Design a protein around this ligand. Sequence first.
Ligand code: HEC
Ligand code: HEC
Lengths: 108, 108
Amino acid sequence: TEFKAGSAKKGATLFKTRCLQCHTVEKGGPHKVGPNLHGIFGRHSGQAEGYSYTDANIKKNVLWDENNMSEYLTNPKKYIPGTKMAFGGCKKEKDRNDLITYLKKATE
Amino acid sequence: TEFKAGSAKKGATLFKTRCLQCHTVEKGGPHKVGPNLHGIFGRHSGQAEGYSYTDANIKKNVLWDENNMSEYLTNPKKYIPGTKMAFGGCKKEKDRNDLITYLKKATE
Ligand code: HEC
Ligand code: HEC
């Protein structure tokens, strides 16, 4: 792709220090600030039920792939102007590779 | 995305008139000229086992999504220079939407 696997272990701790505050990844995990992410790869944005997404997310209608996911994490608001996800971004491709590697595995 | 659903019925007959000559879509379907396509969405290119892909396909390492799939079908060789898939292309977005709609459903 334009994405290369990293460390799922490293990615797990990135998740805990940078995403856990607002999300869960487990099947049967609840929505918190942000939606539960189980089964996000291959799904379009704004389709988790029981979650109130912004108009922005839903209309962007991104199809979530490891590659899309990478550009999004770099700068969320640049990618989805108007999204209420208050996360600065993950600048280093190495960090992003690790995180996505972790996500691809735990959200399945 | 940049893809919108069509007619899976229309897409099924497009498949039969334009792709069947070289591919199968069913789980447990055999490779023919081209590889069996069961479970192609979310998979990267050149990963079907027992199939001899060109160097081109494998190194392109496309992650197959309905959107990627669309650009590919427009013009395969323009998209994967050196691919041995001898298919001209599907010029109309309407045709492509229908086909991909069919594929998303039958390759799952
Ligand atoms: C709270 C401060 C958040 C943190 C930290 C992270 N995310 Fe988030 N995310 C949050 C919200 C409120 C939302 C919904 C946005 C809206 O505008 O409706 C999101 C959304 C996502 C998405 C899109 C999901 C979809 O179903 O379309 C993804 C893929 C996502 N968030 C992932 C994610 C990751 C991996 C994070 C750590 C780097 C992360 N987010 C941080 C809130 C918050
Ligand atoms: C024989 C004349 C073909 C027709 C008609 C179609 N395809 Fe094909 N396809 C063919 C070959 C020999 C190969 C392998 C290419 C290589 O260079 O190794 C392919 C490949 C694909 C792929 C990539 C699959 C992967 O696993 O990476 C896809 C997604 C694909 N073909 C789909 C497809 C569709 C939907 C067609 C009808 C419009 C179609 N192909 C026509 C041979 C032939």
